[PDB]
Design an enzyme around this catalytic site. Structure first.
Site, PDB file in Angstrom:
ATOM      1  N   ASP A   1       1.715   1.513  -3.709  1.00  0.00           N
ATOM      2  CA  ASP A   1       0.556   1.999  -4.458  1.00  0.00           C
ATOM      3  C   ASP A   1       0.362   3.510  -4.325  1.00  0.00           C
ATOM      4  O   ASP A   1       0.005   4.183  -5.298  1.00  0.00           O
ATOM      5  CB  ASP A   1      -0.694   1.245  -4.016  1.00  0.00           C
ATOM      6  CG  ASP A   1      -0.837  -0.092  -4.709  1.00  0.00           C
ATOM      7  OD1 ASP A   1      -0.106  -1.029  -4.341  1.00  0.00           O
ATOM      8  OD2 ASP A   1      -1.684  -0.210  -5.618  1.00  0.00           O
TER       9      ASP A   1
ATOM     10  N   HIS B   1       0.822  -1.214   0.000  1.00  0.00           N
ATOM     11  CA  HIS B   1       0.000   0.000   0.000  1.00  0.00           C
ATOM     12  C   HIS B   1       0.857   1.265   0.000  1.00  0.00           C
ATOM     13  O   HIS B   1       0.429   2.306  -0.511  1.00  0.00           O
ATOM     14  CB  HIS B   1      -0.926   0.006   1.216  1.00  0.00           C
ATOM     15  CG  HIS B   1      -1.949  -1.085   1.209  1.00  0.00           C
ATOM     16  ND1 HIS B   1      -2.199  -1.868   0.103  1.00  0.00           N
ATOM     17  CD2 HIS B   1      -2.788  -1.524   2.176  1.00  0.00           C
ATOM     18  CE1 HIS B   1      -3.147  -2.741   0.389  1.00  0.00           C
ATOM     19  NE2 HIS B   1      -3.522  -2.555   1.641  1.00  0.00           N
TER      20      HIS B   1
HETATM   21  C1  LIG Z   1      -6.974  -5.825  -6.843  1.00  0.00           C
HETATM   22  N1  LIG Z   1      -5.598  -6.201  -7.294  1.00  0.00           N
HETATM   23  C2  LIG Z   1      -5.262  -7.534  -6.716  1.00  0.00           C
HETATM   24  C3  LIG Z   1      -5.596  -6.321  -8.776  1.00  0.00           C
HETATM   25  C4  LIG Z   1      -4.532  -5.234  -6.841  1.00  0.00           C
HETATM   26  C5  LIG Z   1      -4.749  -4.412  -5.587  1.00  0.00           C
HETATM   27  O1  LIG Z   1      -4.699  -5.195  -4.420  1.00  0.00           O
HETATM   28  P1  LIG Z   1      -3.447  -4.928  -3.376  1.00  0.00           P
HETATM   29  O2  LIG Z   1      -2.156  -4.983  -4.132  1.00  0.00           O
HETATM   30  O3  LIG Z   1      -3.782  -3.749  -2.524  1.00  0.00           O
HETATM   31  O4  LIG Z   1      -3.669  -6.278  -2.497  1.00  0.00           O
HETATM   32  P2  LIG Z   1      -4.046  -7.764  -3.114  1.00  0.00           P
HETATM   33  O5  LIG Z   1      -5.520  -7.871  -3.341  1.00  0.00           O
HETATM   34  O6  LIG Z   1      -3.071  -8.120  -4.190  1.00  0.00           O
HETATM   35  O7  LIG Z   1      -3.628  -8.576  -1.751  1.00  0.00           O
HETATM   36  C6  LIG Z   1      -2.349  -9.167  -1.682  1.00  0.00           C
HETATM   37  C7  LIG Z   1      -1.972  -9.332  -0.225  1.00  0.00           C
HETATM   38  O8  LIG Z   1      -0.683  -9.931  -0.087  1.00  0.00           O
HETATM   39  C8  LIG Z   1      -0.013  -9.408   1.021  1.00  0.00           C
HETATM   40  N2  LIG Z   1       1.317  -8.947   0.666  1.00  0.00           N
HETATM   41  C9  LIG Z   1       1.452  -7.923  -0.210  1.00  0.00           C
HETATM   42  C10 LIG Z   1       2.655  -7.447  -0.576  1.00  0.00           C
HETATM   43  C11 LIG Z   1       3.790  -8.086  -0.002  1.00  0.00           C
HETATM   44  N3  LIG Z   1       5.012  -7.665  -0.317  1.00  0.00           N
HETATM   45  N4  LIG Z   1       3.669  -9.080   0.854  1.00  0.00           N
HETATM   46  C12 LIG Z   1       2.460  -9.546   1.220  1.00  0.00           C
HETATM   47  O9  LIG Z   1       2.325 -10.464   2.006  1.00  0.00           O
HETATM   48  C13 LIG Z   1      -0.930  -8.377   1.675  1.00  0.00           C
HETATM   49  O10 LIG Z   1      -1.581  -8.964   2.768  1.00  0.00           O
HETATM   50  C14 LIG Z   1      -1.868  -8.007   0.520  1.00  0.00           C
HETATM   51  O11 LIG Z   1      -3.135  -7.646   1.000  1.00  0.00           O
HETATM   52 MG   LIG Z   2      -0.815  -3.407  -4.397  1.00  0.00          MG
END
Ligand SMILES: C[N+](C)(C)CCOP(=O)([O-])OP(=O)(O)OC[C@H]1O[C@@H](n2ccc(N)nc2=O)[C@H](O)[C@@H]1O
Ligand SMILES: [Mg+2]
Ligand SMILES: C[N+](C)(C)CCOP(=O)([O-])OP(=O)(O)OC[C@H]1O[C@@H](n2ccc(N)nc2=O)[C@H](O)[C@@H]1O
Ligand SMILES: [Mg+2]
Ligand SMILES: [Mg+2]
Ligand SMILES: [Mg+2]
Lengths: 380, 380
Positions: free
Chosen positions: A131, A128
């Protein structure tokens, strides 16, 4: 060299108390909803993630994503700094490919994290946090593609609305504890932006200057009108939940603070941007639009990242932050009838805000990583 | 009526944590030094305090002192608001008598407190809190007596220097733990001010407009030159001790904070006063000098009172305080080319700053009084 550089990026005082990090360890990610286009792309992303080797740590993909996104947008900013010139067509293609790579790498990082048992609170904060920085550059790159610098009021509104909408999505998460996806979300907006760049390749300035016969409005206002319509729709879904969905005592936030408290932070950023625009005697935004958006974008990205930190630690938000020093320098300069050239002050404000963001992020990431005993970019 | 009024003066959140009040209970007053004129007045003050009945609480004398001081100065401000008119002679006599009563009531309150075993941390905080408010009005009244409003730069410097010197005396106490009296202190300055008012009675404007033959400077600059000479001398004594007398770890303050941290607070007050003066298009200070000094005086008095609180609780100082909202309203107004009349905004800033000071003081006094179980204005 390594000791001075490490001292340069660490904050002098630890940003988190010992009790909030322990409370951060008890956090468990919860999300709900489904976007409109997401189920079709899942099959593609499930294919792609299986090809990534298991030794690549999640946070290294994210940083690759940002680096590709930063480099392509900065190159586009380098060719078109007032947003009136035309860059070579391949630069827009590179940005188009870069954003497609970004989206694809973002959507697979959590799948890699799950599959490898490397899910951690550091990963969620970093994601996040990544993002929040990328969002300013994608909307800026969009504005370059449509040459919106010739109409600054529309350019100002659209860029800051996207940052405000993205913050507000995270604001809902701070009150309710759950990420809720709309019918139109990050995926639809980014897909709309990639196609728009391809039309900028095909039609150039003559297409964007063509008149829409039914509305008697210029074509450049249509993405901005879509931004107005999109903002109203998205805010309506988000705003019902902040006012009715508070899970704290007496309907407060999960931290026990007022539900209006995050508004003041992003509101201050947007208001400061508005103060400097309308008072500038030299038409600062019109002469240097990309540099201005980048300056306040880093301020806005940090404030979003503080809310993520505030979310993950279940803590209150302090309105007083060093991120506002840079804008204040610009603000004080305009108070003295621009005794120094505002363009020089804006570069000072840019460099400060960039380093201040990086210093905060590195210090928070290193402190959490040391406490949970994992490495940020390496799997044990 | 009593419930709404009590709610109006209590702060929504308690200003002190439970651990600082307990640490406040362990505080023990320590003072050192002796002023030049103090030993002669002790015989007079020892006579006077013995005539005060033992049932009068200490804090009630102090509040009587402030009330006499406020009323006489406000009456003087009412007659001479631009500092150019001449008030009736009896008004200066009333101020002269009022300040003599103030000094006499102040110097006996601690003697009454000792004799009656009613010494308390509330009394020490209230006393120094009363001294901080009185100081702005005495220097303002002095400025009226010499008609210094016709020369604003000297008026600006002298009034703010006195507030800064008084804060700096308390700053030394925050680092070193001990009140140190100089050869020239509050007693000599106030005695100089009472005699000066009597010369203003005897000689009027012609005396103050008379030329000093040896220096070719106007007589009005001599108290200001005395203020310059006095500031340099007093700062030299104070500044040696802040830089060499730190009793904390590695020579820090007793709270473990940087020895330069209190400078930023009073510096911000003085700097804000300077920003509004030099940018004002309407010559705001020259048209309304008394109202301006009162506005920033309440801001300055609160900031001094916060340092006293910070001293008594052995806590850090937060730069962010609601006291600056009022000056900021004035500051923002001047940023928009005075879209509202600054005179109206100054009244708004005055009323806010007064109520904000009173709200803080009442809330802190009531919280401490409830914890130590004594009444502020009543002896059990
Ligand atoms: C809707 N998407 C999936 C297309 C993208 C936006 O979604 P995002 O990136 O905020 O979260 P996601 O829906 O991919 O969730 C992936 C999850 O993996 C975990 N996560 C993320 C990044 C990271 N380096 N390590 C993790 O463990 C977090 O808990 C995250 O919430
Ligand atoms: Mg993301
Ligand atoms: C030098 N003087 C005495 C002429 C005046 C300035 O001195 P001051 O008023 O800051 O303090 P002081 O020297 O009178 O000390 C009196 C002491 O009595 C105590 N005190 C004061 C006021 C009050 N309501 N209750 C008290 O118990 C405080 O500990 C204070 O320190
Ligand atoms: Mg992801
Ligand atoms: Mg006293
Ligand atoms: Mg006193």
């Amino acid at each position: 060299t390594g000791c001075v550089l490490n001292k340069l990026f660490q904050l002098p005082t630890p940003p988190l108390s010992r009790h909030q990090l322990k409370r951060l360890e008890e956090h468990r990610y919860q999300s709900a909803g489904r976007s409109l286009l997401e189920p079709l792309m899942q099959g593609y992303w499930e294919w792609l993630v299986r090809r990534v080797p298991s030794w690549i740590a999640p946070n290294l993909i994210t940083i690759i994503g940002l680096s590709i996104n930063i480099c392509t947008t900065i190159l586009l900013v380098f060719y078109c700094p007032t947003a009136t010139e035309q860059a070579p067509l391949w630069a827009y293609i590179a940005c188009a490919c870069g954003l497609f790579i970004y989206q694809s790498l973002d959507a697979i990082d959590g799948k890699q994290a799950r599959r490898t048992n490397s899910s951690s609170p550091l990963g969620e904060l970093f994601d996040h946090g990544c993002d929040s920085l990328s969002t300013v550059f994608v909307v800026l790159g969009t504005c370059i593609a449509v040459q919106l610098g010739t109409n600054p009021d529309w350019m100002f509104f659209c860029c800051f609305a996207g940052t405000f909408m993205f913050y507000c999505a995270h604001w809902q998460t701070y009150v309710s504890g759950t990420l809720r996806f709309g019918i139109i979300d990050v995926t639809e907006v980014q897909i709309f932006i990639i196609i728009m760049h391809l039309l900028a390749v095909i039609g150039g300035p003559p297409f964007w200057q063509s008149m829409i016969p039914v509305l008697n409005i210029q074509m450049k206002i249509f993405p901005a009108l879509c931004t107005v319509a999109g903002t109203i729709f998205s805010c309506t879904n988000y705003f019902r939940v902040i006012f009715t969905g508070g899970v704290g005592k007496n309907g407060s936030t999960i931290a026990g603070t007022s539900v209006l408290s995050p508004f003041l932070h992003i509101g201050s950023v947007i208001t400061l941007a508005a103060m400097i625009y309308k008072k500038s005697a030299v038409q600062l935004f019109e002469k240097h639009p990309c540099l201005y958006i980048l300056t306040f974008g880093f301020v806005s990205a940090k404030i979003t990242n503080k809310l993520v930190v505030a979310h993950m630690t279940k803590s209150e938000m302090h309105l007083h932050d060093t991120a506002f020093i840079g804008p204040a320098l610009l603000f004080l300069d305009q108070y003295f009838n621009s005794f120094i050239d505002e363009y020089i002050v804006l570069w000072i404000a840019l460099v400060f805000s960039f380093f201040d963001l990086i210093r905060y992020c590195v210090s928070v990431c290193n402190q959490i990583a040391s406490h949970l005993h994992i490495h940020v970019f390496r799997i044990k």
